[PDB]
């Protein structure tokens, strides 16, 4: 797969930071351009060599973009035929790319300085390609939600229509002689005792704050009326901006509703409590109960343990096999299984049901029918075994990669010892009709799981 | 001066009380009383800013011969949002007030802190000029009416705060009067910043009450599914004695909302075995099928009941 | 790769392969997998363990990328008490070379 070596990937780490060199330069080409346009007619000297700067880079690019690897997505495969990439280039954001890439600014300085050459810059606005794929590359990403990219890409819209927006702005007042400069917006403004007439003398950056404080009032369409399109040059292009704008940001608002419709976990949480806290309500179930219930909810909500529930849409071969990577670690250390077949805790695991465990939480009080087998994940439990005035008597203080239910399911007797929840804990549940099928199925591992309870109960004295 | 002096006591008193104060611990969930664990997690986060912002920065400004780079340190001060923003995420944490109007709260009292540190941000760019560039800034230009704010600086504080949170609250509204607007470079690019900040700020408030009201009601949908019906009940002409029995039954589905059922399901086995062994336990007792029977039984079939009510 | 049916479950579901393969796994008390058959295009499964109303004989997972037809065991119940005739037919096919293998009485 190393032939046509000649060509890089596309995920080459070199040609990435090559992508991002290229995306800065991209974003400062596209903000440029409409500046070195309307705020003059010419770019003066101080920038001589910038401009230049930027065209080789993107020459550069140009020629990379004719040696990199495409992902041909009707075969969904990384295509590397020179060929194949390069003709797809030529056909495809290519004459853009170039005809962007001419000395504009020193042809227009050559060819008599004609102002029709200069609309031939706006050509480098297709540099915007970069930022454009950057914020596709984002919205494939999973780390950032769908909306929130969506969010930021109309952001930049707006950053970027109401900078182009300022830099015609500012254009259309250079479009009309100095005498007729009271019919321009900027030099008719007059703002405080400083007066922004003869715009054309005014610092490019003074104007350049002068449009974007204009274009922002028209953004936000707040537009106090300080400063307003006069001529009619002026009123078509305020016209077109406005309504563009108006489009615009009722797609923003769009994409904030949305994403704040999607939902939040602190809200999905939040409306799972009301209707327990209806369902508690109705059926007048005791404060202690209520809490109870209530906080092993917020406990659910807050380990994302729930996110289980998604498992129940993944089939139950794939979801064994995620149990099987997940909590066999923990059963394979588990002494009450200490020495039995792959089979028997493959089985095992595959009827596991994770469970987390407020503090303070009883979780089979002594005596009671066992009906599920806890095995300790994480935490600290308490076997109190209270007694008849033994209460709270002396524990095995069950930690992590211990067992408790067990010994009455083996023993077939009632629930030797209550069982105290200390911290949080990743108590792992199987059910105990489950474990005696299993049992069934597996005899020998059954007698092995006799034989390491005597082991453990000769020392152990509660369980002996 | 007395109510800055007793004002960083408040916030110092406060300080003394959090390396006395227990939390739960993220991992154990237990209230932890060690008090070293509680004075290390008050170092490590929320310590250095609410100090800090006690300093008396009034008199050290005073203090250093006049420094305004000093007074730029009070808005230190604005850490002590926190107080507020932990206070909106409790009230979000509690069931009585919804999550989303919780929110609607949060963005409007965000509304308010922002047009009223604009307003601040905005007149004190106006002071930043000197006094004798007054027709310059966005206040000594003023002429509302017949009262020029000429001298602004020697106006009554409230007539230049009110006139500020004016310009601010009506370019929040994106009303933009042009009453009160922008004039130097300074006060320019603070009003886009602001603006474009607002813009989004105000997107979001409409996003909440959009998603507020989206999120309807159950009453909402009740209404929905009930209306559809008797839509339904309009075309075909059902009978009144029907229609009220049709009525009825979705009444019964809604009203009895009996569908949180399916939500004790997102309980651990054993509380949800309590919940059944409380709830249906006792009519199961009296069924004369399970006479004499083990508690094993029902304590085990209750956990699979299904409630279901039906009209005669 | 995935599995349609578990031996020791009830049938329910009469699976007619209609593209890919399946194989026939059967596993026994020592924990071994034997590959019975393999299951082709025009192929079914489900259909012995429905009619005789036994736990499924063999677990069937999945070779090829598999497209089937399931079909409920109560309406499969329904169209065979619809069609008596049809339904000694299935009998007969289940018995006809197959037979009673799988304790067909």
Not at 377 to 389: R, Y
Request: net charge neutral; glycine share 4%; with cysteine.
């Amino acid at each position: 797969h190393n032939d046509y070596k000649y060509i890089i990937h596309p995920k080459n780490r070199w040609y990435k930071a090559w992508e991002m060199f290229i995306l800065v330069w991209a974003i400062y080409s596209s903000l440029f351009t409409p500046m070195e346009f309307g705020f003059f007619r010419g770019l003066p000297e101080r920038l001589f060599v910038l401009d230049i700067v930027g065209q080789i880079a993107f020459l550069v690019d140009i020629v990379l973009q004719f040696f990199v690897a495409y992902r041909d997505t009707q075969t969904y495969r990384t295509v590397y035929k020179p060929t194949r990439i390069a003709f797809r280039y030529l056909k495809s954001h290519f004459l853009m790319d170039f005809i962007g890439c001419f000395p504009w600014d020193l042809i227009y300085k050559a060819s008599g300085k004609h102002e029709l050459v200069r609309y031939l810059l706006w050509i480098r606005l297709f540099r915007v390609r970069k930022v454009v794929e950057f914020f596709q590359r984002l919205e494939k990403d999973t780390r950032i939600n769908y909306l929130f990219t969506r969010i930021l890409k109309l952001l930049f819209v707006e950053v970027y229509c109401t900078h182009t927006a300022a830099c015609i702005f500012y254009y259309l007042a250079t479009t009309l002689p100095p005498e007729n400069e009271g019919y321009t917006w900027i030099g008719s403004l007059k703002l405080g005792d400083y007066s922004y007439e003869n715009f054309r003398e005014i610092d490019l950056w003074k104007r350049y704050t002068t449009a974007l404080y204009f274009a922002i009032v028209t953004m936000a369409t707040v537009g106090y009326g300080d400063i307003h399109a006069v001529n009619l040059r002026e009123m078509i292009f305020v016209m077109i901006y406005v309504s563009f704008d108006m489009v615009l940001g009722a797609y923003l608002i769009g994409n904030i509703t949305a994403l704040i419709v999607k939902g939040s976990n602190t809200e999905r949480f939040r409306d799972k409590m009301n209707d327990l806290i209806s369902f508690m309500n109705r059926k007048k179930l005791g404060r202690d109960l209520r809490s109870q219930i209530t906080g092993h909810v917020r406990l659910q909500y807050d380990s994302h343990y729930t996110d289980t529930v998604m498992l129940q849409d993944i089939p139950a071969s794939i979801r064994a096999k995620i149990a099987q990577l997940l909590y066999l670690p923990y059963i394979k250390k588990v002494p009450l299984f200490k020495g039995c077949s792959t089979e028997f805790i493959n089985q095992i695991v595959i009827r596991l049901h994770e469970e987390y465990f407020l503090p303070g939480e009883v979780i089979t009080e002594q005596g009671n029918v066992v009906d599920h087998l806890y095995f300790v994940c994480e935490g600290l439990l308490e076997a109190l075994v209270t007694k008849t005035d033994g209460s709270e008597e002396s524990v095995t203080l069950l930690g992590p990669h211990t067992s408790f239910g067990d010994i009455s399911i083996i023993c077939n007797i009632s629930q030797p010892f209550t069982v105290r929840v200390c911290e949080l804990c990743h108590l792992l549940r199987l059910d105990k009709q489950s474990f005696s099928n299993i049992l069934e199925i597996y005899f020998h591992d059954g007698r092995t799981i006799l034989n390491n309870i005597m082991e453990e109960k000769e020392s152990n004295d509660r369980i002996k």
